[PDB]
Design a protein around this ligand. Structure first.
Ligand SMILES: Nc1ncnc2c1ncn2[C@H]1C[C@H](O)[C@@H](COP(=O)(O)OP(=O)(O)OP(=O)(O)O)O1
Lengths: 36, 100, 50
């Protein structure tokens, strides 16, 4: 079946998108040698 | 900076005396280094200003040099500030030439 | 006042300094230097008072 692999794809896609969404506002908040 | 008033400076003649007799023993080492350690706003910069704006010290040392270092700093600005205090022109220049 | 002539005989080195809302210390210092007659030298603050 494609069922088990489709739900594996679902879980890993949703974890990627969730991590992006909750990381992004922290970057929205702040903005930012060797010699001899 | 070494510019102050020396009229509000409430008596520091003992500390000034002791540090002057430390500086008269400069040749007895190879390079005498001294430390003024204390909490914030206690008198460290002003006791240093009271030291090397005296006259015996100015006869002793040819080229007295003040250098301000802060929280925020970089190496090459310290280097060229030493150059300015010596008498070299403030030349836009890089670090390896400065120590030479 | 200080474009009169008696005042210009009185004072050797009259100095105008513009300070505004927006300012910084070292530009005031080097503007005093320019008004005195020193060269506008790229330089830091502790040397300026000396
Ligand atoms: N003996 C003194 N008589 C009069 N004023 C003094 C005396 N000692 C210190 N002051 C004044 C000078 C300054 O206005 C203020 C801060 O002292 P200062 O020497 O600049 O601090 P400090 O060198 O002890 O520490 P820091 O540089 O970290 O602030 O105290």
């Amino acid at each position: 079946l494609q069922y088990k692999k489709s739900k594996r794809l679902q879980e890993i896609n949703e974890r990627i998108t969730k991590i992006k969404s909750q990381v992004e506002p922290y970057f929205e908040f702040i903005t930012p040698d060797r010699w001899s | 900076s070494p510019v102050y008033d020396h009229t509000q400076v409430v008596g520091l003649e003992g500390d000034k005396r002791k540090i002057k007799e430390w500086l008269f023993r400069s040749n007895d080492s190879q390079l005498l280094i001294m430390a003024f350690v204390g909490m914030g706003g206690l008198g460290k910069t002003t006791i240093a200003q009271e030291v090397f704006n005296d006259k015996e010290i100015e006869h002793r040392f040819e080229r007295r040099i003040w250098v301000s270092v802060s929280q925020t700093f970089t190496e090459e600005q310290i280097m060229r500030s030493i150059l300015r205090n010596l008498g070299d022109a403030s030349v836009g220049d890089d670090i390896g030439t400065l120590l030479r």
